[PDB]
Design a binder for this molecule. Structure first.
Ligand SMILES: O=c1[nH]cnc2c1ncn2[C@@H]1O[C@H](COP(=O)(O)O)[C@@H](O)[C@H]1O
Ligand SMILES: O=c1[nH]cnc2c1ncn2[C@@H]1O[C@H](COP(=O)(O)O)[C@@H](O)[C@H]1O
Lengths: 173, 178
C-alpha cells in the first residue's frame, strides 16, 4: 500500500530509549511530512468507516499523542472529538482511573449509549488504552474499537484490550 | 462573524479552577462540535495566510492542548507540524527550557533536529495566559536558529499581558477575555 508506505517510512526507531534494550518508535516525522500525516489519517478513517459505517458518534483522543491524531481523524469522519486527559487537568466534575498514572474525563463528555472509538499514537502494554476504555465505560459509553498508528506486538496489548477490538496501521515486535 | 461565534459559543468557563478567583476557559467543547473546530482552524489559517502569505515553513504545536490544533492547522496550510513537548518524552538529542508555571517550574523540550537554521515557524497553543509557555517555545525555536513569525491561540487572557511578554514576536488570538 503506497499510502501505508508514506507512513512507515516516516517512523524513526531509536534503540535503548528510554531504557537499554527497548526500541522507541518515534512518530514525529509523520507529523512533519504533511503527505505522511494525511495518509495516516486517511488510512485510519477508511478502516473505521469500513468497519463501523455510521455507528461512531465520537472519537476519543488520548493525552497527549492521541491529541495529534484524534481531531484530524474526527474531522475526516465528520465527527467531534472528546478528550481523555492526564488527571488534574480537566475542570468540572470528572471521573478518573489509575493504571502509576491517572486518566481523567469530564462527566458530560458523553451521554449513556453513545459509541466511541479511542485513538492513541501507539499501543505497547495496553495499560493506557485499557484505562481509557474503563473510564468511558463508566460514562456508559460503548467503546467500538481502539486504534493506533503503531502496535508493539510482543507486548500483547491487543489481548489486554479484548474483547474491545483493536486496529493498528503498523506492527513491530 | 458567524464563524467566530461558532467558536465563542463553545468556550466553557469554570470559576475558581484551578484556584479561587480565576476563571478557567475550557476549549473542550470546540473539539466536540465538528463545525466549531473547523471554524477555529479556518479562522486561524485565514489569518496566517493573510499575514505571511507563503512564508511559513512549519507549524509548531505545544504539548498538550496545542497538539489538538497544530496538525489540523498545518494540514489546512499544506505544512508539516513540529512538536514542542514537556521535557523527558523525546528521543535523540534535545534542547530544553524552563519557565514558571503556577508555584514551581516546568520544562519544554525540542529535538535538536526539528528545524534547520532559517526555517520559519508559527507556534500554536490553545490559550495564552502569562505567556510563559509560549515564551519558552520561542526561546527553544530561537536556539535552533529558526525564525518565529508569529504565535497564535484560540483564547487570550488580556489582563495577564502575555502579548507584551512575547514582543517583539507578533501574537494573534481568536477570542479575548480579561
Ligand atoms: O515506543 C514508543 N514510542 C512512542 N510512544 C510510546 C512508545 N511506547 C509507549 N509509548 C507511549 O506510551 C503509551 C502506550 O503505553 P502502554 O500503556 O504501555 O500501551 C502511548 O500513549 C504512547 O504515547
Ligand atoms: O484558563 C485556561 N484554560 C485552559 N488552559 C489554560 C488556562 N490557563 C493556562 N492554561 C494552559 O497553560 C498554558 C499557558 O499558560 P501561560 O504559560 O501562563 O501562558 C497553555 O498551555 C494552556 O493550555
Amino acid at each position: 500500500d503506497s499510502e501505508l508506505q508514506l507512513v512507515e517510512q516516516r517512523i524513526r526507531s531509536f534503540p535503548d530509549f528510554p531504557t537499554p534494550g527497548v526500541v522507541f518508535r518515534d512518530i514525529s516525522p509523520v507529523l512533519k511530512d504533511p503527505a505522511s500525516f494525511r495518509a495516516a489519517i486517511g488510512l485510519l478513517a477508511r478502516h473505521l468507516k469500513a468497519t463501523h459505517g455510521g455507528r461512531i458518534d465520537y472519537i476519543a483522543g488520548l493525552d497527549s499523542r492521541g491529541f495529534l491524531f484524534g481531531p484530524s481523524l474526527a474531522q475526516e469522519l465528520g465527527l467531534g472529538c472528546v478528550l481523555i486527559r492526564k488527571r488534574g487537568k480537566l475542570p468540572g466534575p470528572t471521573l478518573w482511573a489509575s493504571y502509576k498514572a491517572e486518566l481523567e474525563i469530564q462527566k458530560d463528555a458523553l451521554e449513556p449509549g453513545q459509541r466511541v472509538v479511542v485513538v492513541d499514537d501507539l499501543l505497547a502494554t495496553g495499560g493506557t488504552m485499557n484505562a481509557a476504555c474503563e473510564l468511558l465505560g463508566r460514562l456508559q459509553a460503548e467503546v467500538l474499537e481502539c486504534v493506533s498508528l503503531v502496535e508493539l506486538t510482543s507486548l500483547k496489548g491487543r489481548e489486554k484490550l479484548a474483547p474491545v477490538p483493536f486496529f493498528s496501521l503498523l506492527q513491530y515486535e
